Design a protein around this nucleic acid. Structure first.
Lengths: 122, 206, 119, 54, 115
RNA sequence: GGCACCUCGAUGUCGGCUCAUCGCAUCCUGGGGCUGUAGUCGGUCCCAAGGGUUGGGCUGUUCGCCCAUUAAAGCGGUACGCGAGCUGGGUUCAGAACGUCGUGAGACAGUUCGGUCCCUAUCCGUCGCGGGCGCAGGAAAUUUGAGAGGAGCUGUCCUUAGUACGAGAGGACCGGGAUGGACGCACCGCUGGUGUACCAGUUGUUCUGCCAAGGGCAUCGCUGGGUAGCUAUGUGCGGACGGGAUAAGUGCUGAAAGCAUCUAAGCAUGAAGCCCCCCUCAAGAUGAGAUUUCCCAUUCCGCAAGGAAGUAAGAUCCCUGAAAGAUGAUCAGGUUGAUAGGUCUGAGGUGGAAGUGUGGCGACACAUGGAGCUGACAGAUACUAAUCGAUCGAGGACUUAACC
């Protein structure tokens, strides 16, 4: 459960390091975000050389959280931290290379592009 | 329509030949017996009232014993009735067992709820409570009564009271497996009521 | 569940330990009803423990019951008196070593007394 | 938090109509002679269920 | 109740499982289907928990992946865990080994008991 | 704003929190008319109050402005709703200061820092829960439903179909399908949380004569877990299909008034709107309903008006309890019995007990041995307690039909 205002770690080469969820999208008032959904956010700290600077509102999807994610078989997927990747509105990531393991939920949410550039999918 | 009455023994999960995991509700139902066939021309409507499980002769009294002696069975502890059934389908004194249901059928379920007792408004109706700090002496109080001009509080301002014990119906449940050998039922989902209690199961009106 | 006896866990545990030691001391207790009801089960698991009667059993029962004098001329402490005499007496009855006799309540507060004896 | 009017006599009695306390339940003792509660040992004869208790 | 539960779930609980303690390390095969293309993703890791009973028995397993530790959970008796085998026998003390999430990198040693 | 009509032997004044409720002059969702409405979008107007109508930054602020979402971020009334419910930031005390005014004490709908918010609920009213009585005998169950409540909200994607329309751009109506947001209901198998008589490690001190092994206290001494029960952030489901009568609207036929004309006579269609369909309560519904089953119409007195005194069916007192519980109540039980506690077997949890022996100077590690322990959990077991008792509780008026 990623929540409004939660600070997130970034896992791509877009140059953002810490981002800040503006709030989540979907319904009018969505109190929660689990794995897979786009969240609009601002970037709190960033690399010097990067496509995104410090402090602009961007759109992103969380790709791994520490709270569990439930699959229909009975398994759960969970991690040690929270991470997201910046997506421009073409529904494909802004960075060209991402890091670390990524969940399978971004398959059935139509995200083959970031799924392919993922270094590893569990 | 069709339906049976049973006793809720428990609930667990069962795999269904595909990899997904399916929590299930376990209900044992000894074969019920129709005791009376309520008909329209005297009762004002048609129904069948049926009994579920037995009693000892100590707890059996003479009036209900005479009532049961028409169908010539053991005395029945648990008796309920259903409406909308096929009138000529059931002869009085016949059984209903568990096999009239088949796996995959949508099902209306109805049972008494778990009793909880005198709980406050916070538990009872789930409206939020006041601040826990910044000087608040309004920790868990049930909200203002109402306006001033009507000079009284309206009916139905929702106040602390007893919970539970009031029968509730869950709609469109799906029976995943029936075990006629042990007289067991196994419905996906979660079924209301405490353990070893009443539970009645109906074919869904939807 | 199990009763609270109007006190928290420390002096509650001390209370039950003290009463069961008293039970083994004089085989007959006068006390109130609810103390008797929660007394029965615990003294009878110590009775099962003494029936077991091995060294692990000795140390386990030592960890709960306390050391009073029970037969002073033989200097018999409560542990050894239990573990020798009462286990040998009641080894055969596989449960139910306790009886409750209810009485009229006290003058002071109307608290319902009960008679506890080991039999 | 104050009584706005005095409570009249019939109101007072009408409230107190339930504050009467019930009789206990007596039963004739196993040992002869006297009255005893149910499920209590005998105060006078000192007996219960026919058995004697000191 | 638990009698009737285990008789109703005996036919579904699995049997081919080597008995394992929750301080050991395993590899588990899952038969995940992606695009109707059935394939096996192996998962190497260390048990962190073993909880439940009957077929409510479940266990879970940790792995460090690309500098990120991952939890993987399963019910014990799913049909779609294809193959499981022990690679190495661990020596621990706790029943539930929860602190491994904090302990990251080498200092998560699991000793080989060789038993 | 004007007037001063109740209140100065006190009617607490802004805003916020908790809680709603009503109106419609409708913000969205529903149905339509006109369009300077091609289509995607709109503008206005009409019918429509069923439901919904977001989180932040700033200021005490309502109000505003801004950021980001949403279908939409409605307007108002209820002592500018709601202080014997809460808040005290500001105004509205006593201290102190600044600017200004005054010779001065002092003053400013000028500012700034600080500044005691009492009440054990009597009666209505509200939410639950009991006792009595009534329902022309006395009981155990099952019901009918007058009549009350609640839910009654919506998006996105796929297809129809890049199809109608459009030089083009762009892009449908209607109809199917999948999935979600928010609410509500229910419930612990799963994810977890709690879990203070469960288990394990551990410091200080003290105690059990000493070692070992334990006890007490130190927030449950601390720390890691954890059964039942309760629980959400966890799981399952709902708001579907329909019917009837309609609103705005669209009509068919047709005169008054040879035509015309949805109109007066007739016949239709037509909404998230009304009544049902869904869920719950419900015969105190004094109009006290209905069904089935059992008990029978005894003993006395004034003989009779009618009483009293034992009873039947069936209950109660009392006792063991919980799935119920503030107590009442409900439900499971009370010796032909599994109700509760033991005992035994388990699940599950903690996890390698003591005591031995080995290795080691040693702290320690090994085998004995998934050992030892186990609150609520589930099966058996008459071991202990539900014993002897007692109390209450029927005997039934006029007429029409009908037959002893």
């Amino acid at each position: 459960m990623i929540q409004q205002e939660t600070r997130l770690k970034v896992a791509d080469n877009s140059g953002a390091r810490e981002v800040l969820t503006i709030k989540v999208l979907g319904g009018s008032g969505r109190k929660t975000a689990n794995i897979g959904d786009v969240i609009v956010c601002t970037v709190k700290q960033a690399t010097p050389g990067g496509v995104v600077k410090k402090g602009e509102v961007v759109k992103a999807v969380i790709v791994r959280t520490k709270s569990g994610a439930r699959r229909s078989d009975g398994s759960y997927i969970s991690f040690d931290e929270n991470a997201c990747v910046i997506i421009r509105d073409d529904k494909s990531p802004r960075g060209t290379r991402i890091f670390g393991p990524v969940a399978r939920e971004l398959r059935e949410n139509n995200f083959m592009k970031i799924v392919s550039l993922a270094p590893e999918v569990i | 329509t069709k339906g049976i009455l049973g006793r809720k023994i428990g609930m667990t999960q069962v795999f269904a030949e595909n990899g997904d995991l399916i929590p299930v509700t376990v209900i044992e139902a000894a074969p019920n017996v129709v005791l009376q066939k309520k008909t329209a021309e005297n009762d004002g409507y048609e129904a069948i009232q049926l009994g579920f499980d037995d009693k000892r002769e100590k707890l059996s009294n003479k009036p209900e014993k005479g009532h049961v002696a028409k169908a010539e069975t053991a005395p029945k502890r648990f008796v309920k009735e259903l409406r909308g059934v096929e009138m000529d389908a059931y002869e009085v004194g016949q059984e209903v067992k568990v096999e009239i249901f088949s796996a995959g059928e949508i099902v209306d379920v109805t049972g008494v709820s778990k009793g909880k007792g005198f709980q406050g408004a916070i538990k009872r109706h789930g409206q939020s409570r006041g601040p826990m700090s910044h000087g608040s002496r309004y920790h868990r109080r049930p909200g203002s009564m109402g306006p001033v001009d009507p000079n009284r509080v309206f009916k139905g301002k929702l106040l602390p009271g007893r919970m539970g014990g009031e029968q509730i119906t869950v709609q469109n449940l799906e029976i995943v497996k029936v075990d006629a050998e042990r007289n067991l039922l196994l419905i996906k989902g979660n079924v209301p009521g405490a353990k070893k209690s009443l539970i009645t199961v109906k074919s869904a009106v939807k | 569940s199990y009763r609270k006896l109007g006190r928290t866990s420390a002096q509650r545990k001390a209370m039950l330990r003290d009463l069961t030691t008293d039970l083994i001391i004089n085989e007959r207790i006068e006390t109130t009803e609810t103390r008797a009801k929660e007394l029965r089960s615990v003294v009878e698991k110590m009775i099962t423990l003494g029936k077991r009667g091995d060294l692990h059993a000795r140390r386990q029962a030592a960890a709960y019951i306390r050391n009073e004098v029970a037969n002073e001329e033989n200097n018999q402490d409560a542990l050894q008196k239990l573990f020798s005499d009462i286990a040998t007496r009641y080894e055969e009855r596989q449960g139910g070593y306790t009886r409750i006799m209810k009485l009229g309540p006290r003058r002071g507060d109307g608290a319902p007394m009960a008679i506890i004896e080991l039999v | 938090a104050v009584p706005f009017r005095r409570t009249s006599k019939m109101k007072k009695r009408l409230r107190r109509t339930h504050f009467k306390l019930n009789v206990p339940g007596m039963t004739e003792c196993p040992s002869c002679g006297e009255m005893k509660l149910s499920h209590r040992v005998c105060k006078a004869c000192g007996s219960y269920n026919g058995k004697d208790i000191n | 109740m638990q009698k009737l539960i285990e008789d109703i779930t005996k036919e579904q609980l699995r049997t081919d499982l080597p008995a394992f303690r929750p301080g050991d390390t395993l590899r588990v095969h899952v038969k995940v289907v992606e695009g109707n293309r059935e394939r096996i993703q192996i998962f190497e890791g260390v048990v962190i928990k073993r909880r439940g009973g009957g077929i409510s028995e479940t266990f879970t397993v940790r792995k460090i992946s690309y500098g990120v530790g991952v939890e993987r959970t399963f019910p014990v008796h799913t049909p779609k865990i294809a193959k499981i085998e022990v690679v190495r026998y661990g020596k621990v003390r706790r029943a539930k080994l929860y602190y491994l999430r904090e302990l990251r990198g080498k200092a998560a040693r699991i000793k080989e008991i060789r038993r």
